[PDB]
Amino acid sequence: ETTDGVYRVMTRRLLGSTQVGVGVMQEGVFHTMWHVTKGAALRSGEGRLDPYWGDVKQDLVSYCGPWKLDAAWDGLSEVQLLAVPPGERAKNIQTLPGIFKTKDGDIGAVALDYPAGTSGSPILDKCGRVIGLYGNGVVIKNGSYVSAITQGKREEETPVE
Amino acid sequence: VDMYIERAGDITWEKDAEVTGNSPRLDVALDESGDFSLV
Numbered sequence: 001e002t003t004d005g006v007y008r009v010m011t012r013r014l015l016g017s018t019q020v021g022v023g024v025m026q027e028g029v030f031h032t033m034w035h036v037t038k039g040a041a042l043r044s045g046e047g048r049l050d051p052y053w054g055d056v057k058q059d060l061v062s063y064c065g066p067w068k069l070d071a072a073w074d075g076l077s078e079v080q081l082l083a084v085p086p087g088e089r090a091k092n093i094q095t096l097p098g099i100f101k102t103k104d105g106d107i108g109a110v111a112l113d114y115p116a117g118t119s120g121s122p123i124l125d126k127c128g129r130v131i132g133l134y135g136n137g138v139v140i141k142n143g144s145y146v147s148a149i150t151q152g153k154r155e156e157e158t159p160v161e
Numbered sequence: 162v163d164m165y166i167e168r169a170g171d172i173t174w175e176k177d178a179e180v181t182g183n184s185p186r187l188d189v190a191l192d193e194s195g196d197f198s199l200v
């Protein structure tokens with residue numbers, strides 16, 4: 001199914017399932033981080049979701065259509081991580097982002113530390129819009145974690161022949 | 162082999178949420194494979 005919301009990304013081998021990440025269904029497109037799926041296909045119920053767009057440098061992949069999430073952090077405001085940890089209820093946690101300063105500009109970044117299978121959980125603004133996905137980050141000196149607020153580009157529609 | 166998705170909820174901002182975390186400012190580099198590293 002492709003009903004809007006947040007989803008766990010699970011793998012099954014022989015014994016039971018493991019949550020490897022999280023992603024966002026919006027406008028019939030599933031959005032997650034590349035390192036969650038490695039860009040491979042997903043099952044949804046009886047149906048297959050095929051990768052459509054992705055970029056390993058952004059660490060993002062979308063399924064069934066192009067990247068739909070276009071809201072950005074405004075900079076100044078607090079945000080919420082809608083964390084969906086393995087084995088746990090979805091929970092909101094509010095924080096004021098820090099900044100990853102890069103040679104190409106600043107990226108909002110949240111100092112929130114969750115299990116690796118929380119990767120792909122959405123970060124929200126106060127309108128409930130998804131401004132990025134959690135889980136591509138750095139480990140600072142004391143071992144704690146800071147995640148970029150990773151957002152894709154919603155491209156203009158492609159022309160038709 | 163079987164990677165699959167299962168719905169986990171609606172996406173909403175929570176009005177009276179717990180607040181935590183500092184706001185670190187970090188110099189970082191992003192490489193072509195999507196790795197952030199501290200400079």
Ligand SMILES: N=C(N)N[C@@H]1CCCCNC(=O)[C@H](CCCCN)NC(=O)[C@H](CCCCN)NC(=O)Cc2cccc(c2)CNC(=O)CCNC1=O
Binds near residue numbers: 144196
């Ligand atoms: N380390 C934490 N405090 N929290 C992290 C949070 C993870 C949140 C979801 N995101 C990820 O899994 C992504 C996947 C790779 C993306 C690459 N594009 N990983 C990273 O962003 C950084 C990248 C660091 C810089 C690369 N130059 N990797 C780690 O953190 C791995 C690490 C390091 C030391 C010790 C540990 C695990 C041991 N802890 C555990 O197993 C408990 C679980 N918690 C953790 O794994």
